[PDB]
Design a protein around this ligand. Structure first.
Ligand SMILES: *[C@@H]1O[C@H](CO)[C@@H](O[C@H]2O[C@H](CO)[C@@H](O)[C@H](O)[C@H]2NC(C)=O)[C@H](O)[C@H]1NC(C)=O
Ligand SMILES: *[C@@H]1O[C@H](CO)[C@@H](O)[C@H](O)[C@H]1NC(C)=O
Lengths: 393, 336, 51
């Protein structure tokens, strides 16, 4: 109980495309379609997270007139060393009684910092990406919005009309197999795996989640001998790999991705990627179609172009004189692919005239306009525009 | 009140002034630069906003004076790198400050007597740029971007530090030469002593003791602090008597994700040509200029514009996207 | 639930109250040091340090 119209439009956001619906024996129908947003959401799998590390150093155990002993502790990057022949000083003199038989125990371990809850970079593994589109359709003089997955299976019914979007001609994605996410920025990075991090580089500190209990650390923590008569724990350690990455990361995918892709987070997605085409299937119901006999018959048609400028927008105006059989609504469509008309449907009655806006790139545009079921030839002499570059597609 | 148990302390400082090391009452412990906005979380040995009687007072700060804690003015407290810093938050051992580009960090104050006590540590300070424009003053209206800062709220609920009992404080004034013997004056304090002579040479005393046939240089005396609490500082030695006996206290000004307002650079005068775009840039401050092609080959190019510059860019059939600072990206397409 | 030498007591209600630090300063800090790993430590720290 209807008619299925199948059409293919280019995958470009912000451009209104016109399509002619011609059901045999029924008056033609014109539909205006515009892609509002095309979203490519990749399937994520979190490997690990990285943040700033915290070197936990307790008070050094200074043993006066005796030897200190280091015990092996199950802590990340745990370092322990006992220094002999120490003589430390405090505000009111020496801390130890002996001079040559005193020892100092220095111990330190690496763990996640307090900032890890707020400041962190997530290492994801991108899988098969899901495509979805938001389409604006000018159906029966009203604008309707259709949101569906671009897979050619998900059907969405809006005003008794069934819409099937896709499948996408190109399976292209700006993301690689391994991606890194920081706040609102996504980076294509071949990050080191879990338990294989290097000191001073991205992944020097690794953890499953920002609230996880266990932590992997490789920061090259080496304890040094303290200064003469000084109580302190000196150490040599490679600086934070996360802090170094924050200044060396460069430009994110929002600025580097091809086809003019817009990158958003929470969840991560590719928005408005101008790549390939998109097929659209519309199952228009029986009630929407009007018979050719029940539609007004157009006779004695003539066309005149009083103003034209060949631009990307509708820089042409056309006046079409007509003689109608009865009062009714008629569809307006350009039979020449080089010219596009702004109007889709206008009211027709008696011996009157209609005004239409058209867009063309040709200097001498000869096009045919189909009002209802009758055609009329238009002669247009279009002139060059003011600017060579435009800010609209 | 958590400050009744805790006390300000004396710790090691590599530079107290003129490149000389000392036992500083304003000694630096940890400097946190996790905030993207530029705010620093500085940890010191003294306590700000608390008096010696443990009562809260924002106009006063307590520091360790020789052996007993003393009161000092808040106005005298200063933070500096290469130029003086702007103080934003002060509570306990913590300091919040906005500092300019510097290679070192100094935290100082003026005590009861007009004498300046400072501590210098080598800390590379250069906060990263928020957005795409290098501005000086913060605007009231602008683009909202995600950033992190340490909240100026005095309440402590999230972050924490380790606290334990202080070690035996050495004091040479406890020992005196009584004719030809050592005299230890307790003065109502638990004293731990050790002598290089016979008999009762060592032990933990709560009363006055006399060491017979001994010299003052041959003995060592220290005061035990078991009544108060102190931060687990690597600049302070561990207590010899107790093992791994530790406690924990909540710390003010935790890191939280917020919003940073950035200004948008003025739109440049634009002129068009055959598959070409000309922009006459006028920056008031360093502004990032980036561009890419909207096709298969994007060819990303970026440059930090400092002053008046004219840019000639090519516009292909696929399109050209231009981003001028914090402004929304301009898109260009050729006619026909 | 908090610990003290050999007896179990509720963290928010210690036996030293009112004013734990004022009565015994050494005994209060030693009590907190043994309950550092306990989940209700901050409930005890709030009660013991209030007079
Ligand atoms: C259907 O939607 C389109 C697009 O939003 C509307 O078209 C125009 O709307 C405004 C009219 O002055 C302008 O601000 C837009 O530039 C213009 N857009 C285009 C692509 O032509 C249209 O009026 C809507 N019609 C109904 C009946 O809702
Ligand atoms: C923001 O901070 C809070 C508290 O630290 C944390 O729960 C949350 O995950 C953070 N979110 C981001 C996006 O950093």
């Amino acid at each position: 109980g209807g008619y299925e119209h199948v059409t293919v439009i280019p995958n470009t956001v912000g451009v209104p495309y016109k399509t002619l619906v011609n059901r045999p024996g029924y008056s033609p129908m014109v539909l205006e379609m515009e892609l509002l947003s095309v979203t490519l959401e990749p399937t994520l799998s979190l490997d690990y997270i990285t943040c700033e590390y915290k070197t936990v150093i307790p008070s050094p155990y200074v043993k006066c007139c005796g030897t200190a002993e280091c015990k092996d502790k199950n802590l990340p990057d745990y370092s322990c060393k006992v220094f002999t022949g120490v003589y430390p000083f405090m505000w009111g003199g020496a801390y130890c009684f002996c001079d040559a038989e005193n020892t100092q125990l220095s111990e330190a371990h690496v763990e996640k910092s307090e900032s890890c809850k707020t400041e962190f970079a997530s290492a994801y593994r991108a899988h098969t990406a899901s495509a979805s589109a938001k389409l604006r359709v000018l159906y029966q003089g009203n604008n309707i919005t259709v949101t569906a997955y671009a897979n050619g299976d998900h059907a969405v019914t809006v005003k008794d009309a069934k819409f099937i979007v896709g499948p996408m001609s190109s399976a292209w994605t700006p993301f690689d197999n391994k991606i890194v996410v920081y706040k609102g920025d996504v980076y294509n990075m071949d990050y080191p795996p879990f338990g294989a991090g290097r000191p001073g580089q991205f992944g020097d500190i690794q953890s499953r989640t920002p609230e996880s209990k266990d932590v992997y650390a490789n920061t090259q923590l080496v304890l040094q001998r303290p200064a003469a008569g000084t109580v302190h724990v000196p150490y040599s350690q490679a600086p934070s790999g996360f802090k170094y990455w924050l200044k060396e990361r460069g430009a994110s995918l929002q600025h580097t991705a091809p086809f003019g892709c817009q990158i958003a987070t929470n969840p991560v997605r590719a928005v408005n990627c101008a790549v390939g085409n998109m097929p659209i299937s519309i199952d228009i119901p029986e009630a929407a179609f009007t018979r050719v006999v029940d539609a007004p018959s157009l006779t004695d048609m003539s066309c005149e172009v009083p103003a034209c400028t060949h631009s990307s927008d509708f820089g042409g105006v056309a006046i079409i004189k007509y003689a109608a059989s009865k009062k009714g609504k008629c569809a307006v469509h350009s039979m020449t692919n080089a010219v596009t008309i702004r109007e889709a449907e206008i009211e027709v009655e008696g011996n009157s005239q209609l005004q239409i806006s058209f867009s063309t790139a040709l200097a001498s545009a000869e096009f045919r306009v189909q009002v209802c079921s009758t055609q009329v030839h238009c002669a247009a002499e279009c002139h060059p525009p003011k600017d060579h570059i435009v800010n609209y597609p | 009140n958590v400050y009744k148990a805790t006390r300000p302390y004396l710790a090691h400082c590599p530079d107290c002034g003129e490149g000389h090391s000392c036992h500083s009452p304003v000694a630096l412990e940890r400097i946190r630069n996790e905030a993207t906005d530029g705010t620093l979380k500085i940890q010191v040995s003294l306590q700000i906003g608390i008096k010696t009687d443990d009562s809260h007072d924002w106009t006063k700060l307590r520091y360790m004076d020789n052996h007993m804690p003393a009161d000092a003015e808040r106005a005298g407290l200063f933070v500096r790198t290469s130029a003086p810093c702007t103080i934003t938050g002060t509570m306990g051992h913590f300091i919040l400050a906005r500092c300019p580009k510097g290679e070192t960090l100094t935290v100082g104050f003026t005590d009861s007597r007009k004498i300046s006590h400072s501590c210098t540590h080598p800390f590379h300070h250069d906060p990263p740029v928020i957005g795409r424009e290098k501005f000086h003053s913060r605007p009231q209206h602008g683009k909202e971007l995600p950033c992190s800062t340490y909240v100026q709220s005095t309440a402590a609920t999230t972050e924490e530090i380790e606290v334990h009992m202080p070690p035996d404080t050495p004091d040479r004034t406890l020992m005196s030469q009584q004719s030809g013997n050592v005299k230890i004056t307790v003065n109502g304090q638990t004293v731990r002593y050790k002598c290089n002579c016979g008999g009762s040479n060592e032990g933990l005393t709560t009363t006055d003791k006399v060491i017979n046939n001994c010299k003052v240089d041959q003995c060592h005396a220290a005061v035990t602090n078991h009544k108060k609490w102190q931060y687990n500082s690597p600049l302070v030695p561990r207590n010899a008597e107790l093992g791994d006996r530790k406690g924990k206290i909540h710390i003010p000004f935790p890191l939280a994700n917020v919003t940073c307002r950035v200004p948008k650079a003025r739109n440049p005068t634009v002129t068009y040509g055959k598959n070409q775009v000309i922009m006459l840039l006028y920056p008031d401050h360093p502004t990032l200029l980036s561009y890419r092609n909207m096709g298969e080959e994007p060819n990303y190019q970026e440059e930090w514009v400092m002053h008046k510059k004219e840019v000639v860019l090519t516009v292909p059939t696929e399109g050209l996207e231009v981003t001028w600072g914090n402004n929304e990206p301009y898109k260009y397409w050729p006619q026909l | 639930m908090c610990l003290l030498a050999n007896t179990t007591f509720p963290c928010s209600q210690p036996p030293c109250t009112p004013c734990c630090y004022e009565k015994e300063p050494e005994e209060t800090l030693r009590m907190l040091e043994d309950n550092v790993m306990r989940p209700g430590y901050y409930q005890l720290l709030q009660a013991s340090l209030t007079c």
